[PDB]
């Protein structure tokens, strides 16, 4: 008696309303979402009348004095055959469904005007919701999400916003022993998406049930920040998420640098080729007492005469990487800086990798130390994976967070 499309909707709503992740709708959430859909408290007499009917007609419908999914589906299947579809339709409407039982576009994509220069970040409520969601689908409570848990989480979505195996497990911090996405990495992946694709973030937040939980549009999950002068306003809006473009020639070792941002032990990335092309890596660092998220975009390696796109040049901080063991490697960095960054307002940091081996001379006309000295740049940062030092990442974020 229940439509296959209607059942799909009622299932998602059950998962959203299951705030304990125990496959049950206890008294609390039943009353809470009652005001979400009907703006009235659920009077105790009705709830008893509801449970009694479910218990009477449906086995395994009431477990531990709580409504199960099998009983929840029956109740609305009973509502439609008793001439009260408006009760069911009031619930479907609140969780973002229209007359065609499809997610409303105005419910998924609310209008958000982003001024030039402004960035998109997660708000306090947006973070809290994502934290709440995380700990619900962390059934075993190991403080991390398994690929089985990560699938259930986005079962209320058409698909996952990212691959578990080829994205979040390689672009975000994970648990060292289990190899699963921690709470920290969870917030990192959402922070990355929110900055580069806010519309997708809000679209997925609606699917996860942010609108119903927060009793507001997903605009409350997005916090728009921008770099402003010495404004004496009481409402601070300083940035906390910066993006760094990592540009270098082939074999520069800049890829291994990006991945090292995510692991405490970099002694396992020394002699390793990367089979997966991770575009954006992200982690947080402490900058003067404040938490700052840094995104290390691995710009696609090309020839030295090949042009760089404006959207590849324009960033918060440019990290030009060359190989110290390759005499013909620094010439790319010198070529790139002069053409694209020499006359820009973007802070640039030159990094020499693989300094563990003997730093051979560069077959260029100027040496890296002299080149930086000529264009008033900081001395070339010697980076190595055998050292496990992470001052570079903290430095990069600081250059993006501060003048010039
Ligand atoms: N659908 C529930 C309220 C919202 O979860 C009920 O009417 O029993
Ligand atoms: Ca888990
Ligand atoms: Na629950």
């Amino acid at each position: 008696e229940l439509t296959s499309a209607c059942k799909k909707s009622l299932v998602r709503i059950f998962k959203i309303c299951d705030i304990d992740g125990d496959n049950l709708l206890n008294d609390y959430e039943l009353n809470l979402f009652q005001r979400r859909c009907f703006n009235t408290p659920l009077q105790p007499q009705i709830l008893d009348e509801v449970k009694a009917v479910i218990q009477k007609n449906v086995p395994d419908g009431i477990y531990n004095d709580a409504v199960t999914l099998k009983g929840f589906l029956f109740l609305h299947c009973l509502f439609i055959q008793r001439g009260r579809n408006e009760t069911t339709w009031a619930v479907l409407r609140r969780f973002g469904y229209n007359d065609q039982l499809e997610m409303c576009q105005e419910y998924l994509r609310p209008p958000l005007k982003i001024p030039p220069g402004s960035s998109t970040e997660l708000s306090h409520r947006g973070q809290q919701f994502l934290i709440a969601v995380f700990e619900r689908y962390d059934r075993d409570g190991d403080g991390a999400l398994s690929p089985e848990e990560h699938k259930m989480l986005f079962s209320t979505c058409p698909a996952a916003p990212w691959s578990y195996s080829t994205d979040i497990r390689k672009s975000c911090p994970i648990n060292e022993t289990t190899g699963w996405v921690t709470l920290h990495g969870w917030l990192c992946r959402w922070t990355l998406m929110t900055l580069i694709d806010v519309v997708k973030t809000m679209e997925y937040l609606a699917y996860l049930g942010f609108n119903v939980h927060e009793n507001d549009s997903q605009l409350a999950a997005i916090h728009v920040t921008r770099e402003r002068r010495i404004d004496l306003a009481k409402r601070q809006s300083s940035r906390s998420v910066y993006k760094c473009h990592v540009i270098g020639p082939k074999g520069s070792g800049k890829t291994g640098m990006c991945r090292g941002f995510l692991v405490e032990d970099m002694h396992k990335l020394i002699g390793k080729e990367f089979k997966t092309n991770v575009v954006n890596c992200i982690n947080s660092v402490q900058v003067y007492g404040q938490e700052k998220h840094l995104i290390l975009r691995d710009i696609d390696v090309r020839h030295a005469l090949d042009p760089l796109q404006p959207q590849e040049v324009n960033c918060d901080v440019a990290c030009l990487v060359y190989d110290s063991s390759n005499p013909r490697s620094f010439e790319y960095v010198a070529r790139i800086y002069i053409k694209y960054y020499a006359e820009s307002k973007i802070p640039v940091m030159i990094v020499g990798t693989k300094c563990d081996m003997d730093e051979r001379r560069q077959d260029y006309l100027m040496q890296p130390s002299e080149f930086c000295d000529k264009y008033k740049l900081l001395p070339p940062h010697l980076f190595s994976l055998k050292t496990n030092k992470k001052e570079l990442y903290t430095k990069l974020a600081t250059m993006a967070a501060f003048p010039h």
Side-chain angles (χ1 to χ4, degrees), residues 1-228 230 232-233 237-355 362-404:
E1 294 286 348
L2 202 61
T3 310
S4 183
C6 187
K7 179 179 176 298
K8 185 184 64 61
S9 302
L10 293 176
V11 161
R12 165 180 172 266
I13 298 181
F14 182 85
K15 298 178 178 178
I16 295 180
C17 291
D18 185 20
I19 61 178
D20 294 321
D22 59 337
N23 304 116
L24 301 172
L25 293 184
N26 300 278
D27 292 332
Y28 172 77
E29 47 269 30
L30 287 179
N31 180 40
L32 173 60
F33 297 108
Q34 181 66 26
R35 300 198 313 269
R36 290 299 201 271
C37 302
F38 303 95
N39 200 22
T40 60
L42 183 62
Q43 46 192 187
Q45 184 175 353
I46 298 187
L47 185 62
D48 296 327
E49 295 176 5
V50 167
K51 292 183 178 182
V53 166
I54 299 180
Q55 181 69 269
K56 174 185 177 181
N57 293 263
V58 177
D60 307 325
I62 305 296
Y63 189 87
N64 296 13
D65 202 38
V67 183
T68 68
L69 174 59
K70 190 173 302 178
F72 177 76
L73 296 176
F74 167 78
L75 185 63
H76 292 278
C77 185
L78 185 63
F79 285 153
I80 60 101
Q81 64 188 192
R82 289 196 187 275
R84 283 184 171 89
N85 62 322
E86 295 188 9
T87 298
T88 300
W89 273 113
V91 176
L92 297 174
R93 182 177 184 84
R94 188 57 178 87
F95 286 79
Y97 290 106
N98 52 21
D99 57 337
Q100 297 293 129
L101 288 177
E102 296 288 340
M103 292 293 298
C104 183
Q105 296 295 330
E106 307 169 8
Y107 189 89
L108 292 179
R109 305 165 178 265
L112 179 62
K113 198 73 174 184
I114 303 302
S118 297
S119 298
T120 57
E121 299 183 2
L122 289 173
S123 69
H124 175 64
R125 304 269 74 260
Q127 294 172 352
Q128 288 302 116
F129 175 75
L130 295 175
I131 295 176
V133 170
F134 179 89
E135 293 176 346
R136 288 185 187 106
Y137 292 96
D138 185 24
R139 306 304 181 92
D140 55 340
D142 60 333
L145 284 180
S146 69
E148 305 88 37
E149 293 170 335
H150 191 275
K151 182 181 180 181
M152 290 193 303
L153 198 152
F154 296 106
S155 64
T156 58
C157 305
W162 50 71
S163 174
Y164 181 86
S165 57
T166 76
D167 197 327
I168 194 176
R169 195 179 171 271
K170 301 180 178 301
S171 59
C172 299
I174 60 180
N175 177 267
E176 207 281 335
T177 134
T178 67
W180 294 333
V181 179
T182 62
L183 174 58
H184 179 64
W186 171 255
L187 297 175
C188 286
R189 192 52 254 255
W190 280 89
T191 305
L192 165 61
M193 171 170 295
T194 310
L195 185 63
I196 66 183
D197 201 334
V198 57
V199 182
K200 184 178 182 183
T201 302
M202 308 180 79
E203 177 174 327
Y204 271 79
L205 285 170
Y207 280 137
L208 295 175
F210 178 85
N211 303 23
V212 189
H213 279 198
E214 200 59 50
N215 192 18
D216 200 340
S217 71
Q218 45 271 51
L219 291 169
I222 308 301
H223 177 53
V224 179
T225 64
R226 68 188 188 97
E227 189 67 24
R228 190 54 164 87
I230 317 184
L232 210 40
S237 298
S238 59
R239 300 178 59 192
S240 60
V241 190
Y242 304 103
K243 179 164 56 61
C244 175
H245 288 175
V246 187
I247 311 177
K250 185 182 62 61
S252 60
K254 67 184 183 65
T255 300
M257 184 191 70
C258 296
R259 309 299 182 89
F261 191 23
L262 313 176
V263 288
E264 311 89 324
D265 182 34
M266 283 185 271
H267 295 292
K268 207 174 182 179
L269 299 178
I270 305 177
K272 178 180 181 179
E273 57 178 359
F274 298 98
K275 65 192 67 177
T276 303
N277 180 266
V278 175
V279 181
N280 296 316
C281 289
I282 185 179
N283 201 334
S284 65
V285 292
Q286 294 293 315
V287 177
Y288 289 151
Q290 287 194 352
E291 181 183 9
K292 299 294 178 61
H293 280 86
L294 180 58
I295 304 176
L296 298 182
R297 177 169 298 176
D298 201 335
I299 301 297
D300 298 89
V301 183
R302 64 203 65 182
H303 194 267
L305 299 181
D306 293 347
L308 287 179
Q309 302 299 326
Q311 48 275 7
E312 294 175 324
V313 177
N314 191 29
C315 59
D316 291 317
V317 49
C319 180
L320 309 183
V321 179
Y322 72 98
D323 193 345
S324 294
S325 59
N326 199 339
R328 59 172 187 86
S329 182
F330 178 76
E331 47 177 324
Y332 181 79
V333 171
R335 152 71 177 175
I336 295 303
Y337 176 82
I338 296 180
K339 184 182 179 182
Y340 299 109
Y341 295 107
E343 302 160 349
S344 64
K345 297 295 182 299
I346 308 177
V348 178
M349 165 146 290
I350 273 69
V351 172
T353 59
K354 305 172 184 178
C355 295
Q362 294 294 327
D363 288 333
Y364 190 58
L365 303 131
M366 297 191 62
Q367 292 298 324
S369 308
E370 305 173 353
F371 182 83
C372 300
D373 208 327
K374 171 174 171 56
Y375 293 96
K376 292 181 174 58
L377 301 174
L378 305 183
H381 182 91
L382 286 76
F383 175 82
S384 180
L385 294 175
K386 302 183 179 63
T387 325
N388 277 232
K389 291 183 180 178
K390 299 187 175 186
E391 283 69 15
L392 175 60
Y393 308 110
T394 306
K395 177 58 181 181
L396 284 175
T398 310
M399 296 184 63
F402 288 101
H404 337 84

